[PDB]
């Protein structure tokens with residue numbers, strides 16, 4: 488039958504207002520709430536996301552996991568003219584829906600969808616995509632890759648002192664190894680934010696982890 492993703496885009500195109508990103512977010516959330524797709528209702532995690540973008544005003548953001556473009560629209564609507572969101576999405580069908588979503592919101596010029604797995608694309612950012620360091624990273628992809636991809640970003644020289652990581656779903660279904668690493672490491676200053684999931688009626692959360700630069704090369 489019809490995929491979730493084709494129906495989400497349909498609903499936006501039929502109900503939201505072109506070039507009004509807020510209306511796009513609200514349409515996605517309305518539809519996904521009515522369908523009882525708990526993990527696809529973004530308004531609770533979005534309050535935390537908006538505050539992070541407003542405080543730090545990043546010029547270059549990397550998103551891991553686009554899906555249908557909700558979080559890309561959410562962040563990009565608050566970015567400055569000339570600022571950039573790179574979003575990595577390994578499923579080309581989802582990349583396609585995200586592209587259509589951005590076009591409808593009028594935010595396509597601020598976002599570049601990179602089609603592939605984060606583990607493959609991250610090592611290409613410096614040379615292929617001319618990235619220096621990221622100002623912010625939003626982690627919202629495969630749970631078991633949050634810690635590995637953080638370590639990969641570190642190794643590839645893509646984080647600087649001040650880079651803000653914001654990780655979603657760190658409680659449900661959970662990213663406990665990622666949390667233990669950043670909270671335990673002197674290279675990250677961390678803050679936790681609670682975020683509710685309907686239907687399951689559970690308090691999930693997001694973690695903000697601000698990179699402080701690498702640990703000493705010596706003991």
Ligand SMILES: Nc1ncnc2c1ncn2[C@@H]1O[C@H](C[C@@H](N)CC[C@H](N)C(=O)O)[C@@H](O)[C@H]1O
Pocket residue numbers: 529551552553554555556557558559575576577578581603604605606627628629632
């Ligand atoms: N290793 C990976 N690299 C890139 N994309 C991935 C990877 N593992 C999963 N994904 C994608 O991560 C997405 C996970 C979603 N939860 C993203 C939701 C989206 N950020 C939103 O707020 O609506 C899916 O679209 C997956 O196809």
Ligand SMILES: [K+]
Pocket residue numbers: 543544545546
């Ligand atoms: K900035």
Ligand SMILES: [K+]
Pocket residue numbers: 552626627628629630655656
């Ligand atoms: K996730």
Ligand SMILES: [K+]
Pocket residue numbers: 669670671672673674675676677
């Ligand atoms: K820490």
